[PDB]
């Protein structure tokens, strides 16, 4: 019953009679399972902030590190995770990859209360939170199997889009629930509900430069989503950031949707190019907002500039993905025309190739959510400035926009 042996999505008759209904149902359970995995992935971006408030004495370098490490394991587990769905099947893997997330969620619910818990423990739990970051790879591969090649866009769009919204959901919930264990426990009932719901409701089917472009855009969304709260507390220790810090990732997520549509409207490489300009320009204006020696800083501006870095990292993600998508469509066109084949064959293989390549592009891309906050770690621990790290980002976004020129346009 759970196993499907005759799967013909490219066949309209099949889709009408049963495919659409089955694929639709798998999507609807896939989505909550994915956003939840994002919630768990970015935990410390609301937990490392509250660690001293409960009596833990850790360096800011030790609080940024815990916020950075999930993206190391996440990145390393994305390649394997993409091979898991063909091996174990969508339903078995969704249930497992969603279920095992209770381990790290419960653990740090305890460890945060016992004020004598070593740093070595918190390293492990954060690294186990990185497992949830790999779920994206498997979830996305799974969906690509359920949908025909020319429906695939929207469904993949819905899956990753609403999944990414998981960061923003946690940022909003973890403070509200804290009235600590609460931030890390309120998802155990939801993880379980949806491990069960997958198990009984889902089905088992029987260019390095583009890594750099995705790294610069998505790795930045996740990188900022991790370290922003922690940064807006060493720069403005007076303001309680966890009633604003969700709005960043939320706005960034919505910017993905716009990114792709805008990109096909006036050029994937153009919107990418113009966006890195806005990504360096906005990296610069953040110097003027800081509380520096003698000079009084401004929060409103600092916050609004980050709210513009989240927007610009969001657009860039949906802009680089349409770039990749378009590059692969062109390559598959040329090979098939040379083989003397079908426009249909080309369309299918362009979809296959963009999906097979994703488990590797999003692995390289996820390395950014380690660097950005570990940059704020090493900068604010060598000096007393975020400037040292923030200077490297500015240099990087320039290095990227020259690279988009050098190869495209």
């Amino acid at each position: 019953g759970a196993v499907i042996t005759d799967w013909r999505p490219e066949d309209p008759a099949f889709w009408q009679q049963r495919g659409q209904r089955i694929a639709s149902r798998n999507l609807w359970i896939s989505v909550p399972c994915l956003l939840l995995a994002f919630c768990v992935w970015m935990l410390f971006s609301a937990v490392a902030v509250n660690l001293p408030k409960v009596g833990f004495n850790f360096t800011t370098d030790q609080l940024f590190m815990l916020t950075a490490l999930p993206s190391v394991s996440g990145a390393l587990l994305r390649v394997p995770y993409s091979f898991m769905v063909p091996i174990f099947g969508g339903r078995r893997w969704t249930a497992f990859s969603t279920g095992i997330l209770i381990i790290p969620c419960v653990w740090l619910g305890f460890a945060v209360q016992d004020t004598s818990t070593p740093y070595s423990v918190f390293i492990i739990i954060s690294l186990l939170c990185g497992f949830a970051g790999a779920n994206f790879a498997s979830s996305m591969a799974n969906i690509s199997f359920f949908f025909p090649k020319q429906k695939q866009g929207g469904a993949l769009g819905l899956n990753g889009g609403l999944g990414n919204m998981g960061v923003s959901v946690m940022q909003l919930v973890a403070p509200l629930v804290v009235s600590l264990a609460n931030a890390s426990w309120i998802w155990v009932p939801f993880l379980a509900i949806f491990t069960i719901a997958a198990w009984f409701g889902m089905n088992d089917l029987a260019l390095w430069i583009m890594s750099l472009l995705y790294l610069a855009t998505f790795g930045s969304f996740i990188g900022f989503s991790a370290g922003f709260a922690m940064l807006s507390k060493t720069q403005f220790p007076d303001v309680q950031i966890l009633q604003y810090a969700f709005f960043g990732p939320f706005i960034g997520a919505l910017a993905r949707s716009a990114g792709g549509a805008l990109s096909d409207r006036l050029g994937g490489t153009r919107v990418t190019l113009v966006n890195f300009i806005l990504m360096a320009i906005f990296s610069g204006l953040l110097f003027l907002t800081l509380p520096t020696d003698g000079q009084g800083g401004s929060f409103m501006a600092f916050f609004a500039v980050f709210l513009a870095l989240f927007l610009t990292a969001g657009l860039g993600s949906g802009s680089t993905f349409q770039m990749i998508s378009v590059i692969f469509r062109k390559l598959t066109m040329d090979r098939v025309k040379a083989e003397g084949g079908s426009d249909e064959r080309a369309m299918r293989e362009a979809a296959t190739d963009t999906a097979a390549a994703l488990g590797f592009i999003s692995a390289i891309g996820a390395i950014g959510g380690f660097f950005i906050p570990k940059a704020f770690g090493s900068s604010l621990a060598l000096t007393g400035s975020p400037v040292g790290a923030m200077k490297v980002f500015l240099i990087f976004y320039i290095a990227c926009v020259v690279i988009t020129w050098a190869v495209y346009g």
Partner: antibody
Amino acid sequence: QIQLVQSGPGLKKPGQTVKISCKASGYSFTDYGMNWVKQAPGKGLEWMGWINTSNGYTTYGAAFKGRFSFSVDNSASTAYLQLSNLKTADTAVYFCARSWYNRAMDYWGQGTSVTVSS
Amino acid sequence: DILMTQSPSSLSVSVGSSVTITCQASQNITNYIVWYQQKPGQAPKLLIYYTSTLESGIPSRFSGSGSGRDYSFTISNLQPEDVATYYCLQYNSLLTFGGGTKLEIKR
């Protein structure tokens, strides 16, 4: 309690039309396709085609294009086979059967025997 | 159209004996094969789908295997109730029945 129950035996002269029905019950009718199978006396099962129960679209095997019609009444949750200009060779038992794709023909009707004779 | 040759067309086998029916497709049917049991005057009954997956309630004495163009079906501990005509069917491109195998039991 999944069941397909078909109408009863009919006798007809050559030149006439017959319409056999098949009531499905115990399952959501529009989720599964309906196949029709012919068995002439002392012959093997012969697949006639199916009808998509979302489309209402028919698909006919080569030998059954012309005088054959699959139709559908979704609200009655039943399927029909219409045979026009009956020939003697149409004498057979006719089965409806659920499913084109996963578990093909996993539930059968009891069959409906048609005799073409003067 | 994809053709299906079924062998044998009839056989007589002892109680507790093993039957083997083979089916050859005219081209690759990519594991989409089903097997039916047709006791006379009754409605056919699906035993196996997708080469080897037994329908629920169907006794373990039944089995199937194959790939590409070649498939077989087996009844191992033959009981008197197993008397019937058996059919393979291809449901790859359209559907095609095998010609049948009328199984007589011996006593």
